[PDB]
Design brief:
This protein has 330 residues and is mainly beta. It contains 4 helices and 24 strands. The protein has a 7-stranded mixed sheet with strand order 18-17-12-13-22-14-21. It has a 6-stranded mixed beta barrel with strand order 2-3-8-4-7-6. Strands 15-16-20-19 form a 4-stranded antiparallel sheet, with no helix packed on it. Strand 23 and strand 24 form a beta hairpin. The chain binds the ligand CCNC(=O)c1c(-c2ccccc2)csc1NC(=O)CNCCc1c[nH]c2ccccc12. It is classed as hydrolase/hydrolase inhibitor.
């Protein structure tokens, strides 16, 4: 089997991407944020504290003839940005772009934090990292991909995120028309539960490529590109007037600037992130100071190849017995 669904930026800055998902019988369609950096499929629901719902579409398990309460199961997750959510668990039928999993754990939110309440466009998250990160207790649950994998034509999914435009998530096949050149595959460590790999280096604009190992994660659920302070300083040094602002929480730059590209290495291959992908607009409405899309990972503890990086590429998440990642230009 295979599945294919369109993913759409939630706003004009590509702050996140939402993908429609069918849950239950009859189908309830929710727009979920496909997140290769976490492993819980959780949703706004009829159980969510009412003051914490502000425009989201909710899953109502009582209206699904295939929903079953998973007895005694709860979940609770906290992310590095400080956001969180928690609740109970149902199993139900979940479909993505034609690919169906029965008995998928659907984690129903009783509580969500302010960042989630404030994003009316995101009805929940669909985790695509490794199932070892799943938070359901006392019995850990599997991701959608883990559940679907054996049935797929090939045990893979691909992310093709658009810049200011829709893109595609495919499950079970590689669309050879969706990229240019070849796909370069690179080794993955699953030890931290992430799609963790090692970039071979970087360049800033038309500058010389610096060969250096940068370990980090391929994370569709993080907006920005978080890299070591040395690398980030080298990038922003090329933008006149750019500075790290403690008050704003990272590098900012004059909105009148033309940003250089940023290149990262995948083996001998090179993915080029155009400069405009790195512009995240005024820090506050009407400001002429703009927020940068490349920021320091110092204090995260890991580097994160988030949407800013991934949207410059066609990305293969290969869930073969030894997982790997593939990157192609497009
Ligand atoms: C800044 C978002 N990323 C993280 O927190 C994160 C971290 C992390 C750890 C410590 C400090 C900062 C970041 C490691 S892996 C990792 N990746 C994820 O956690 C992926 N899931 C993001 C879920 C998420 C958090 N806030 C949102 C708001 C809208 C849509 C999705 C979200």
């Amino acid at each position: 089997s295979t599945g294919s669904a369109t993913t759409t930026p939630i706003d004009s800055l590509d702050d996140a991407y939402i993908t429609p998902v069918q849950i239950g019988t009859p189908a309830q369609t929710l727009n979920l944020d496909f997140d290769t950096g976490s492993s819980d499929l959780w949703v706004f629901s009829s159980e969510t504290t009412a003051s914490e719902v502000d425009g989201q579409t909710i899953y109502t398990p009582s209206k699904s003839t295939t929903a079953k309460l998973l007895s005694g199961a709860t979940w609770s997750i906290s992310y590095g940005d400080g956001s969180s959510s928690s609740g109970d668990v149902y199993t139900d039928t979940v479909s993505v772009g034609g690919l169906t999993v029965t008995g998928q754990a659907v984690e129903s939110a009783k509580k969500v934090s302010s960042s989630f309440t404030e994003d009316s466009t995101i009805d929940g998250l669909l985790g695509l990292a490794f199932s070892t990160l799943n938070t359901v207790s006392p019995t850990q649950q599997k991701t959608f991909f883990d559940n679907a994998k054996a049935s797929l034509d090939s045990p893979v999914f691909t992310a093709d995120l658009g810049y200011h435009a829709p893109g595609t998530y495919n499950f079970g096949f590689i669309d050879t028309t969706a990229y240019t050149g070849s796909i370069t595959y690179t080794a993955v460590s699953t030890k931290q539960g992430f799609w963790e790999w090692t970039s071979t280096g970087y360049a800033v604009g038309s500058g010389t490529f610096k060969s250096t190992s940068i370990d980090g994660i391929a994370d569709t659920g993080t907006t920005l590109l978080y890299l070591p302070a040395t690398v980030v300083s080298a990038y922003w040094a090329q933008v006149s007037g750019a500075k790290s602002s403690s008050s704003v929480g990272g590098y900012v730059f004059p909105c009148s600037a033309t940003l250089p590209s940023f290149t990262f290495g995948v083996g001998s291959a090179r993915i080029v992130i155009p400069g405009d992908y790195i512009d995240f607009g005024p820090i506050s409405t009407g400001s002429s100071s703009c927020f940068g899309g490349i920021q320091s990972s110092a204090g995260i503890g890991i580097n994160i190849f988030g949407d800013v990086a991934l949207k410059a590429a066609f990305v293969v998440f290969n869930g073969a017995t030894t997982p790997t990642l593939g990157f192609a230009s497009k």
